Amino acid sequence: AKEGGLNVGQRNTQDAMSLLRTGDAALGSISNILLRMRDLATQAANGTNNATDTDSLDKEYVQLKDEIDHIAGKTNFNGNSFLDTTATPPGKDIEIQLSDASGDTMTLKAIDTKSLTTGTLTNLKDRATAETEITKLDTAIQKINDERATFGSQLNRLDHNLNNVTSQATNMAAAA
């Protein structure tokens, strides 16, 4: 159901929780790919690879970059590609009205996953480039960890709202 355009009620909250689980799992896949990319970059920066091995590491690394972009574009809730605000059509925020909470609204914010990950990365075409990729990969791993933390926290918050669960944090926030 809606109330002045805004989405309300238990089933709507469940839908949003489903979007959050989808987003977290997709960002989890992206994080695991970034870890594999970090391993490849570390190997390639090492100094010790010939022409063929340099090429094979670079090929796999670039394939993994493309896989991140694929996941970023394909992930959706009901056709909304919320991990890619640069898509056509762009991912958009999802608004969720909380129940018995004085009209509080949660926004699942759509993000630019590519900008946080592949937009900052290049390739392993040479040893020197591979070395500088490592730092960039560590940065991207941390950014993705924050984005997943956001979705995880929002999921907990919706779970408490939908399931009428009160915790220490609820009791603390009651006065405000």
Residue numbers in the entry: 54 to 229
Manuscript excerpt for this entry:
Among these diverse flagellar proteins, flagellin is a major component of the flagellum that forms the flagellar filament. In the flagellin filament, the D0 and D1 domains mediate inter-molecular and inter-domain interactions and form the helical stem of the filament. In addition to the native function in bacteria as a structural unit of the flagellar filament, flagellin stimulates innate immunity in the host by directly interacting with Toll-like receptor 5 (TLR5), an innate immune receptor. In this study, Bacillus cereus flagellin (BcFlg) was identified as the smallest flagellin consisting only of the D0 and D1 domains that still activated innate immunity as a TLR5 agonist.
To provide a schematic plan for insertional fusion sites, the crystal structure of BcFlg protein was determined at 1.85 Å resolution. The structure contains BcFlg residues 54–229 corresponding to the D1 domain, which was shown to directly interact with TLR5 in a previously reported SdFlg-zfTLR5 structure. The BcFlg structure presents a topology of S1 (residues 54–56) - S2 (residues 59–61) - H1 (residues 63–98) - H2 (residues 104–127) - S3 (residues 147–150) - S4 (residues 158–161) - H3 (residues 166–169) - H3a (residues 171–173) - H4 (residues 180–216) - H5 (residues 221–226). The H1, H2, H4, and H5 helices are α-helices, and the H3 and H3a helices adopt 310 helical structures. BcFlg is structurally similar to its orthologs (PaFlg, SsFlg, SdFlg, and StFlg) in that it contains a three-helix bundle structure (H1, H2, and H4) appended to an S3-S4 β-hairpin. In contrast to the common fold, the BcFlg structure is distinguishable from other flagellin structures in forming unique conformations at the N-terminal and C-terminal regions. BcFlg residues 54–61 that correspond to the N-terminal region of the D1 domain fold into two β-strands, S1 and S2, and their connecting loop. In contrast, in the BcFlg structure, the C-terminal helix in the D1 domain is split into two α-helices, H4 and H5, which are distanced by 11.3 Å and angled by 72.9°. In the SdFlg-zfTLR5 complex structure, the C-terminal region of SdFlg D1 is also discontinued to two α-helices as for the BcFlg structure but with a different distance (16.9 Å) and angle (13.8°). These observations suggest that the C-terminal region of the D1 domain is a pliable helix that can bend and adopt diverse conformations. Because the residues 181–185 form an α helix, an insertional site was selected in BcFlg residues 178–180 (middle fusion, mF) so as not to interrupt the secondary structural fold.
